[PDB]
């Protein structure tokens, strides 16, 4: 269709103006004195929230260009939350900061490409500085403390998480379900988790988790791309009968079929969700079979001449629960026989000896790790349905937080880590003045989150930033008690992974925008 | 879709303006000299009313932002009426008062959060003050007086409610029905009531009480979530035959199945209603059985390997009447055998002995209380249908009132309670000057209802407020006779609960609005 | 009257916008391939010119703010020409460049004051570098060469000027007037020149040179301030009679007296010009006497009790000619008798002996130098009045050029000296990054003249500039034989004084505009 | 791999020349004395040769340098030699990994000239009325 094409400065302010709507909507929730944002619904009462992700999801602008700007930042910023369970909002305020200052500089006549490299150099430098600043999280005592802090000072949640990690390990898979009647339960079941998410958002039935959740579903394992729902029909009806949901795990699900599934499940005609099979090539077929033995199903491959039209429930695998993320599928309690599973583990353990290269060793060990490791299951108990559901939510949060803590440690929260790291890179330089300006841009931008938090608290950003800049390490002033001491000790911390992700991703999109000359979109009519 | 986003001061005026349209419409009916509001109906003559609830129900504004404002207070204020049977209007005027002053303070540059915390502190104090000010309503002589006062001086209503409460206990379940023909009738039948409401406002066949009413229905007890209407069919065809209505009580009823029930019932193709089973986890499966025993039905659990396709009318439970609210299901006169039920009570009472915890004892007693407790049924007689229907309403209202009186007592009406309580908190202070301003805002707002009542009466609010502030205890201003004196004795009272609720809910919404920085809504298309 | 007030950025763009009309109008004439500017006359045939100064005179913009910008640059830049006989256009283009880049910098958030400091530091350095680059004009051979070059390669003009400077010394006063008919004449006559200019532009009757030129005028010497034309009348009727023009040298000429004089001379009722008497305090009374002696006039001192009403034509001084600049008055061929003048000189020489202070001695020495030295008078011959007037004009300009050359030397022309000097200061830095940007702003601007010249010649500016930067000393870009080489020998030069002035004034106004935050002007009424 | 493949295929077919758009300028600088049958054709010739500079100029413009300056520098050298578009070392562009398959530069030139030539000789255009 006829397009609207904008260039240079004209195009850049549009994008900027766009990111401003987004950032300004979202940053008011930042910090403990976060304000509320009211999101209108069709009919009924509007939603009042302090959750920046909820807010971002809703943002879409009328001016197509401003919209593109908002959608760009929205996209990359969401990745931070995906990776570490937080920092989306931070990433957003940061992205705003970099883009504003960067465009100022572009307008002053500085080179966009050099500005970008300067900003990037600053960020890599900052990530290193962040690792040095980081305090490790290894013994289960520390795991419990982090879990507790993320859980709103609840010892119970920390203990729970600690206990579970104690069961399956730091690298283990931990899941959360409704409790059966007050008093928590922990149990390790047969289960697995592979890095593939939903083939489409429409499949989501947990808009809170942004996830798909299926109970006691059947699992179709097909080694081939499924493009047409013609082959699906017989197995779809067998699942419509017995009224259970269905997880399809194929090489891929495309076109006719994917669309048809997205519609049918979204009209209540059988709950279905599809995900690509993990990995690619040979190891993909291997892992498909792994999933087959584990769920007690039969992998239907065209290679040996099997056909989907010729498949009954019996070929289908089975599990107590499956949960699907944007990039993660996790199978909980497969119906597979102890003999079958342990026998498959045995086989895999034979190939590792008869192996050759190191790569082949790692890969095989990853497979048994999945197989033999299992899945910890935390059922949260709590006296009331309401409290139970709530405590369940806080456990989920504390969980992602703790996992991220375990991976890369913790640093001072309240936005001070980004400020300390920045104060340390004052002498950092690049190849020419432009790159140097790029660097200052980024280091100044790293102050945005703290400043906004302070602003929201009704204090003077400059003064607080100064106070913070004066000290060192994770040492600070506890706003709640105004006591000086170690921020981590006083419970004001962030998983190093969240701060890092936020910074890098913010820098990524802001860099891109700063280096954009042209925008093309459809015509407003 | 493309959104319209408003910020800070801009959003807040819009919200204000919107709660102003709402409050101004409802607050004219406050007190004894309340005015009429005329609500148009598309077909026929308009409705003239003085009921703040009916008026509020109709308010929806064209401006999307202003509208969100109104819908917000509309919602929480509504909850006040739902909790204590009155005070929605009061809640609305209070909210208006708090919001108006609060936004004035925000505009002056004071911190919204500190304003909120000050408001809350004042309210917290006021509620305690309200507890002290409160006079208990315990002996049935008192119960009768309150009911009598709520019924417009109708002593017969007081007596009826007093008798009904003595039959089933203060905490018992009491219901109101049409008369057989003059001379009321009272009788205790097998029955039960759990706190779960309609899974949809479309199951409602009694739009005035906003309730579902099924007479001689079958009760399906299914321990599991019902998502697809395919399993229902065999049992649904058996109930279409025998031409009796159907109550489905499951773990939940979702999408396909629920939408199909909502449609088929709204088309007279068989009357049906669905509610979640009470509670969760184990105790939920236990209570489902309690209901089974009570109604002479069979719990259909997939767990034990039972199927809905194979369930017959014989498995269905039965009762003379069930009534469903927004959050209550009450079963009246179940076909349960007076031996089955007694046995069930017996087994449970034995479990109370084997009980290893206090919690377990309390929770099991609730079950015996429900089963063994039963249900009082008051049938209002009156000589001609019209009179009967009017008195039935008065009995229903007075009943709800009297319940609230029994729980937290009663306090001075006519808005004087709030004013008395505010005058006692003159020395209340916060952590900084802003919080002190927040407290003053709340205490000043507590005068709003009285002032409005007085305004509606055509007197000078300041003068009356002033004199009242001068008094002590439950001494106040009788708006109907223009006479000052002891309010409770003069029969001008409110259940402590309604005053408390209205205050709390108003303060709640008011805090949210005061601390709102952003609003996102659709574009006016 | 009610004003229109503009602040910050908004004000700055108006100013810039304004200087841009002036600069763009003026700069097209720069260089040897300068284009024509057509300036419309009162009404007659338009005037076509390549003289940037003429063009500048004519520029006045409708918009009050824009006009203010342009007038400010006109004013500061005009001084360059006043001082060194060239450089105004250059100053203007330099001013445009500095203001342009400076304002970009201010908008990007840099501190105007630090930018100004930087610009100034760069200019200070550049001046020194310019002195270092400069070649002396000391021997009369070089004096003649410069004269010849500035007179379009006319050896005659060079010879003539050299002869003149030889008679009165290089610091002597040299005058040029109409020749008596082919064959030049050079004679030294009794005369003087002091540092006071016309008290009003309206006095100018030679717009070409922006000078007042009086023939056989009478000279009124009044040791007092003349504010009212009532005391003038008697002297003015005498001068009105006799029918010769009038020069007034008083302590000052203000108000009614000045106003009236300006009107009258602009209405042919006696040609009159007024200047402040030279110096101040006591030495002013002394010099007034010097002039008196020289012109055979009599000082009219109120101190001694003399009155202007009693002043006669005989009290008045006389000379064959007087010429008045913006800041110079030069009396040519006084009538005073040699005996008198000589006696005066004797007196001063003796006071020079008696002088008890270096200062006093110096001042006295300055005075005898003026009286005893006289004035050189070049009469330019030609054969045909037309060639005569033209040559006379060339001699005036060349004269001014060589004067400046004699003072501070010559540097490479065509804008190369400025670029050269700029390339030498690459490492120049200030106290902070803002100052540093100020410096670069200045250094880039120093290229503007040459680049503009190249531009007018239809070449790529950047290429030529880059080349010139590659070379050393007085190597650069020619346009007559179009080939790079040695500028001085090749006869492409500028007096160091014009280059220095052009740069310094340009920097001055630019600094001032860059540091402007507020502008006040009348409403367009 | 797919990209490198097409590239190498093209390399094998017709060889490689200096990349960065310099090949075009060199080629252009060699045709300074090239003439046609009349002044108009000669102008056509200049238009084309001047045009052959557009890519470098743009490339340089994108790098934030002065297109005229680099073009000038490039015009001064010969063969596949010159300006190092990353390390400022002089040498053979092909060896320093700065190349384009001769096929790609030639194609771009011929196709460009083709369409431009058609448009330059266009006198009339016919299209639908905006509905």
PDB file of N, CA, C and O in Angstrom, chain A residues 379-402:
ATOM      1  N   UNK A 379       3.612 -26.794  46.262  1.00  0.00           N
ATOM      2  CA  UNK A 379       2.194 -26.449  46.391  1.00  0.00           C
ATOM      3  C   UNK A 379       2.069 -25.484  47.565  1.00  0.00           C
ATOM      4  O   UNK A 379       2.361 -25.854  48.700  1.00  0.00           O
ATOM      5  N   UNK A 380       1.651 -24.254  47.314  1.00  0.00           N
ATOM      6  CA  UNK A 380       1.551 -23.284  48.395  1.00  0.00           C
ATOM      7  C   UNK A 380       0.240 -23.391  49.199  1.00  0.00           C
ATOM      8  O   UNK A 380      -0.836 -23.189  48.647  1.00  0.00           O
ATOM      9  N   UNK A 381       0.331 -23.675  50.500  1.00  0.00           N
ATOM     10  CA  UNK A 381      -0.856 -23.669  51.384  1.00  0.00           C
ATOM     11  C   UNK A 381      -1.106 -22.328  52.092  1.00  0.00           C
ATOM     12  O   UNK A 381      -0.160 -21.561  52.276  1.00  0.00           O
ATOM     13  N   UNK A 382      -2.350 -22.018  52.489  1.00  0.00           N
ATOM     14  CA  UNK A 382      -2.591 -20.701  53.075  1.00  0.00           C
ATOM     15  C   UNK A 382      -3.931 -20.355  53.735  1.00  0.00           C
ATOM     16  O   UNK A 382      -4.324 -19.190  53.698  1.00  0.00           O
ATOM     17  N   UNK A 383      -4.629 -21.305  54.343  1.00  0.00           N
ATOM     18  CA  UNK A 383      -5.875 -20.980  55.110  1.00  0.00           C
ATOM     19  C   UNK A 383      -7.095 -20.506  54.315  1.00  0.00           C
ATOM     20  O   UNK A 383      -8.207 -20.870  54.644  1.00  0.00           O
ATOM     21  N   UNK A 384      -6.882 -19.684  53.300  1.00  0.00           N
ATOM     22  CA  UNK A 384      -7.963 -19.157  52.479  1.00  0.00           C
ATOM     23  C   UNK A 384      -7.647 -19.357  51.002  1.00  0.00           C
ATOM     24  O   UNK A 384      -6.491 -19.382  50.601  1.00  0.00           O
ATOM     25  N   UNK A 385      -8.674 -19.478  50.178  1.00  0.00           N
ATOM     26  CA  UNK A 385      -8.425 -19.514  48.768  1.00  0.00           C
ATOM     27  C   UNK A 385      -7.632 -18.264  48.404  1.00  0.00           C
ATOM     28  O   UNK A 385      -6.597 -18.347  47.747  1.00  0.00           O
ATOM     29  N   UNK A 386      -8.110 -17.117  48.873  1.00  0.00           N
ATOM     30  CA  UNK A 386      -7.563 -15.811  48.507  1.00  0.00           C
ATOM     31  C   UNK A 386      -6.096 -15.652  48.879  1.00  0.00           C
ATOM     32  O   UNK A 386      -5.275 -15.267  48.049  1.00  0.00           O
ATOM     33  N   UNK A 387      -5.778 -15.935  50.136  1.00  0.00           N
ATOM     34  CA  UNK A 387      -4.411 -15.858  50.614  1.00  0.00           C
ATOM     35  C   UNK A 387      -3.524 -16.828  49.836  1.00  0.00           C
ATOM     36  O   UNK A 387      -2.387 -16.480  49.479  1.00  0.00           O
ATOM     37  N   UNK A 388      -4.062 -18.027  49.576  1.00  0.00           N
ATOM     38  CA  UNK A 388      -3.347 -19.095  48.870  1.00  0.00           C
ATOM     39  C   UNK A 388      -2.921 -18.626  47.495  1.00  0.00           C
ATOM     40  O   UNK A 388      -1.740 -18.666  47.160  1.00  0.00           O
ATOM     41  N   UNK A 389      -3.882 -18.164  46.713  1.00  0.00           N
ATOM     42  CA  UNK A 389      -3.583 -17.583  45.406  1.00  0.00           C
ATOM     43  C   UNK A 389      -2.560 -16.431  45.457  1.00  0.00           C
ATOM     44  O   UNK A 389      -1.654 -16.345  44.617  1.00  0.00           O
ATOM     45  N   UNK A 390      -2.694 -15.572  46.462  1.00  0.00           N
ATOM     46  CA  UNK A 390      -1.801 -14.431  46.664  1.00  0.00           C
ATOM     47  C   UNK A 390      -0.390 -14.912  47.004  1.00  0.00           C
ATOM     48  O   UNK A 390       0.600 -14.498  46.369  1.00  0.00           O
ATOM     49  N   UNK A 391      -0.303 -15.775  48.016  1.00  0.00           N
ATOM     50  CA  UNK A 391       0.982 -16.294  48.442  1.00  0.00           C
ATOM     51  C   UNK A 391       1.643 -17.025  47.266  1.00  0.00           C
ATOM     52  O   UNK A 391       2.862 -16.929  47.071  1.00  0.00           O
ATOM     53  N   UNK A 392       0.819 -17.705  46.465  1.00  0.00           N
ATOM     54  CA  UNK A 392       1.277 -18.372  45.241  1.00  0.00           C
ATOM     55  C   UNK A 392       1.945 -17.380  44.300  1.00  0.00           C
ATOM     56  O   UNK A 392       3.043 -17.617  43.799  1.00  0.00           O
ATOM     57  N   UNK A 393       1.293 -16.253  44.088  1.00  0.00           N
ATOM     58  CA  UNK A 393       1.892 -15.200  43.281  1.00  0.00           C
ATOM     59  C   UNK A 393       3.265 -14.710  43.807  1.00  0.00           C
ATOM     60  O   UNK A 393       4.215 -14.561  43.022  1.00  0.00           O
ATOM     61  N   UNK A 394       3.355 -14.462  45.123  1.00  0.00           N
ATOM     62  CA  UNK A 394       4.593 -13.963  45.744  1.00  0.00           C
ATOM     63  C   UNK A 394       5.705 -14.987  45.713  1.00  0.00           C
ATOM     64  O   UNK A 394       6.863 -14.633  45.615  1.00  0.00           O
ATOM     65  N   UNK A 395       5.344 -16.260  45.801  1.00  0.00           N
ATOM     66  CA  UNK A 395       6.310 -17.326  45.655  1.00  0.00           C
ATOM     67  C   UNK A 395       6.867 -17.355  44.228  1.00  0.00           C
ATOM     68  O   UNK A 395       8.081 -17.356  44.061  1.00  0.00           O
ATOM     69  N   UNK A 396       5.988 -17.362  43.209  1.00  0.00           N
ATOM     70  CA  UNK A 396       6.425 -17.257  41.802  1.00  0.00           C
ATOM     71  C   UNK A 396       7.426 -16.106  41.615  1.00  0.00           C
ATOM     72  O   UNK A 396       8.473 -16.283  40.983  1.00  0.00           O
ATOM     73  N   UNK A 397       7.110 -14.932  42.165  1.00  0.00           N
ATOM     74  CA  UNK A 397       8.000 -13.799  42.020  1.00  0.00           C
ATOM     75  C   UNK A 397       9.335 -14.026  42.702  1.00  0.00           C
ATOM     76  O   UNK A 397      10.396 -13.897  42.085  1.00  0.00           O
ATOM     77  N   UNK A 398       9.271 -14.367  43.977  1.00  0.00           N
ATOM     78  CA  UNK A 398      10.467 -14.638  44.727  1.00  0.00           C
ATOM     79  C   UNK A 398      11.291 -15.726  44.029  1.00  0.00           C
ATOM     80  O   UNK A 398      12.521 -15.697  44.049  1.00  0.00           O
ATOM     81  N   UNK A 399      10.613 -16.668  43.388  1.00  0.00           N
ATOM     82  CA  UNK A 399      11.317 -17.726  42.707  1.00  0.00           C
ATOM     83  C   UNK A 399      12.207 -17.203  41.593  1.00  0.00           C
ATOM     84  O   UNK A 399      13.407 -17.459  41.623  1.00  0.00           O
ATOM     85  N   UNK A 400      11.641 -16.475  40.622  1.00  0.00           N
ATOM     86  CA  UNK A 400      12.413 -15.951  39.470  1.00  0.00           C
ATOM     87  C   UNK A 400      13.560 -15.112  39.993  1.00  0.00           C
ATOM     88  O   UNK A 400      14.688 -15.205  39.495  1.00  0.00           O
ATOM     89  N   UNK A 401      13.260 -14.291  41.006  1.00  0.00           N
ATOM     90  CA  UNK A 401      14.226 -13.409  41.633  1.00  0.00           C
ATOM     91  C   UNK A 401      15.400 -14.193  42.207  1.00  0.00           C
ATOM     92  O   UNK A 401      16.559 -13.893  41.927  1.00  0.00           O
ATOM     93  N   UNK A 402      15.088 -15.214  42.996  1.00  0.00           N
ATOM     94  CA  UNK A 402      16.105 -16.049  43.599  1.00  0.00           C
ATOM     95  C   UNK A 402      16.936 -16.786  42.548  1.00  0.00           C
ATOM     96  O   UNK A 402      18.168 -16.859  42.667  1.00  0.00           O
TER      97      UNK A 402
END
